[PDB]
Amino acid sequence: MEHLETGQYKKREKTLAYMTKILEQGIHEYYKSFDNDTARKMALDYFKRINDDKGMIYMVVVDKNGVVLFDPVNPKTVGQSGLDAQSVDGVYYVRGYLEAAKKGGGYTYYKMPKYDGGVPEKKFAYSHYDEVSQMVIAATSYYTDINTENKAIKEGVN
Amino acid sequence: MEHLETGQYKKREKTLAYMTKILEQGIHEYYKSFDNDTARKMALDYFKRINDDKGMIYMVVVDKNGVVLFDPVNPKTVGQSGLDAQSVDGVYYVRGYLEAAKKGGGYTYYKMPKYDGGVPEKKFAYSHYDEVSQMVIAATSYYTDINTENKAIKEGV
């Protein structure tokens, strides 16, 4: 059961890298046509709708310098440098996003609520620097949600 | 192992319904900001790029009347009615897409290659009618691919 759960989390890490790629490909269709401010507004409007779906993933976006562009959980941080932002478990999560992106893509692990004012819970982020939009885009998932999605499989094994 | 495999396929079914929702929400940006013909072009160019990724999903699109709008595996069907199209295992796959969409979303099961002229493999499609684009959008996955992705889990067990 422990090896199963670890496997399911590693699978989800891979899923988030793929989802980030296809989301990037989607937003590029209008980056190619509109000015940066307009195209960014469209992308972040889309990402708001993803997060509002309350499903598999939640997006977070920062610029190359760590300015927070999109994070509905922490709306006061939007438009600010996030370089000194710390999760409740002491992780500089925006530094994590940037370190991962500098490597070509990677993972940051920290605790955060699912919504502004909610109870924190463990999550992880896959981040990647999208050269077309010049954004560091993070697709994120919560371990509780992965467990929920895998509950029928767990019960079957049991 | 059997119940594990079945559970992994059922999970992927739900994943496809979710992915189809977020893809719809994405192409809605095209339809809000570009004329109809340009928005459709953008959507199908996007879907070409997803299929070219050769990852988790491959898209197929038909209109509400069953005219094939997008299917790189079967390029000669694009622009034609697909109501009498059959997979090699005898499934009217476009009829399946439309029946599922009429119910609010659902699943069609059939064999198809991964690319034009390739070996046919078992797959399934989740289809849904997107009211903004007026397209029946199908997100699809191949069982070989689901098995590949779950291989490390299987070996751990």
What resolution does the deposited structure have, in angstroms? Answer: 1.4
CB B16 within 8 A of CB B50: no
**Whole-angstrom distance, CA of residue A98 vs CA of residue A108:** 10
Residue carrying the six token digits 């199209």? B85
Q: Which residues contact A20 (CB under 8 A, 6 or more apart)?
A: A105, A126, A127, A128, A137, A138, A139
Residue carrying the six token digits 């708001």? A48
Which among B8, B30, B149 has the least Cβ separation from residue A29? B30
What would the two tokens of residue A4 be? Answer: 């199963």
Q: At what angle do helices B2-33 and B36-53 cross, to 10 degrees?
A: 150
Q: What is the nearest CA distance from A22 to chain B, expressed in angstroms?
A: 6
Q: Where are the alpha helices (DSSP H) in A32-113?
A: 36-52, 93-102
Other CB atoms within a 10 A radius of the CB of residue B134 amount to 12
Q: What angle do CA B39, B45, B50 make, to 5 degrees?
A: 125
**Whole-angstrom distance, CA of residue B133 vs CA of residue B3:** 38
CB A70 within 8 A of CB A84: no
Per CB distance under 8 Å, which residues of A are interface residues toward B? 3-4, 6-8, 10-11, 14-15, 18-19, 21-23, 25-27, 29-30, 33-34, 42-43, 45-46, 49-50, 53, 55-56, 149-150, 152-153, 156-157
For the domain covering A1-158, report its CATH number.
Answer: 3.30.450.20
Give A18's contacts in chain B (Cβ within 8 Å).
53, 55-56
Domain ranges of chain B: 1-157
Chain A with chain B: Cβ pairs closer than 8 A: 85
**Fold exhibited by the domain B1-157:** Beta-Lactamase (3.30.450)
Which among A7, A46, A56 has the least Cβ separation from residue B29? A46
Q: Which residues contact A105 (CB under 8 A, 6 or more apart)?
A: A17, A20, A126, A127, A128
State which approach was used to obtain the coordinates. Answer: X-ray
Residue A78 is given by DSSP the state B
**Whole-angstrom distance, CA of residue A7 vs CA of residue A5:** 5
Q: Which helix (H) or strand (E) holds B44?
A: helix B36-53
**Whole-angstrom distance, CA of residue B11 vs CA of residue B3:** 12
Q: Which helix (H) or strand (E) holds A70?
A: strand A68-70
Residue B13: φ, ψ to 5°: -55, -50
Residue carrying the six token digits 């007026």? B134
Which among A21, A22, A53 has the least Cβ separation from residue B21? A53
C-alpha torsion sign, points B147, B151, B153, B154: positive
**Helix, coil or strand: residue A58:** strand
CB contact under 8 A, A11 and B156: no
**Whole-angstrom distance, CA of residue B109 vs CA of residue B68:** 18
**Whole-angstrom distance, CA of residue A31 vs CA of residue A28:** 5
Residue of A nearest to B146 (CA): A11
**Whole-angstrom distance, CA of residue A153 vs CA of residue A76:** 39
Picking from A53, A50, A41, the residue whose alpha carbon sits closest to that of residue A23 is: A50
- The residues pairing with A74 across neighbouring beta strands, listed in sequence order, are none
CB B49 within 8 A of CB B42: no
**Whole-angstrom distance, CA of residue A97 vs CA of residue A102:** 9
**Helix, coil or strand: residue B140:** strand
Q: Which helix (H) or strand (E) holds B112?
A: strand B106-112
CB A140 within 8 A of CB A3: no
CB contact under 8 A, A55 and B14: no
**Whole-angstrom distance, CA of residue B24 vs CA of residue B8:** 24
CB contact under 8 A, B11 and A49: no
Q: Give the length of chain A.
A: 158
Which among A11, A23, A42 has the least Cβ separation from residue B150? A11
